[PDB]
Amino acid sequence: GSSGSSGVTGDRAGGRSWCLRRVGMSAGWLLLEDGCEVTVGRGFGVTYQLVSKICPLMISRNHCVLKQNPEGQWTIMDNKSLNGVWLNRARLEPLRVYSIHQGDYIQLGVPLENKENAEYEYEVTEEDWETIYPCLSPKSGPSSG
Numbered sequence: 001g002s003s004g005s006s007g008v009t010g011d012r013a014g015g016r017s018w019c020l021r022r023v024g025m026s027a028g029w030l031l032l033e034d035g036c037e038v039t040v041g042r043g044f045g046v047t048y049q050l051v052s053k054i055c056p057l058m059i060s061r062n063h064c065v066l067k068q069n070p071e072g073q074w075t076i077m078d079n080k081s082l083n084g085v086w087l088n089r090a091r092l093e094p095l096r097v098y099s100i101h102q103g104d105y106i107q108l109g110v111p112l113e114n115k116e117n118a119e120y121e122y123e124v125t126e127e128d129w130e131t132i133y134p135c136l137s138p139k140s141g142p143s144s145g
Contacts, residue, residue, distance in 0.1 A: 013129050017034070019031050022121070037066065038066040076092075076106060083108075107121055
């Protein structure tokens with residue numbers, strides 16, 4: 001799939017919903033609901049938790065936080081990242097605003113000595129809820145059950 005026309009919305013769970021397509025995989029898609037803060041990390045309390053067996057320490061609680069600035073545009077901000085956050089082959093700063101767009105690359109942390117690119121990689125893409133629903137990400141925070 002991943003194809004269709006965009007226009008007016010008039011149906012429950014309709015319209016489009018941005019997200020972070022996991023580069024290299026077809027799962028763990030972090031939904032980016034318009035007007036909904038998305039905090040990723042490992043510590044309990046974040047909307048998205050990421051735990052691994054190889055290097056689970058590589059990620060820290062609240063490694064990053066997405067949100068649409070008062071203007072109405074999505075902006076990725078790093079909550080004082082320790083290892084550092086990368087965006088489109090660029091280093092990010094702590095507590096900074098970065099306007100993202102379709103075709104981006106968010107990297108949580110730095111690559112290893114035996115890994116060309118960071119294990120965790122995503123891509124800002126706009127996909128309907130019915131498209132990311134099937135392959136959604138592990139939500140650690142609350143939700144409208």
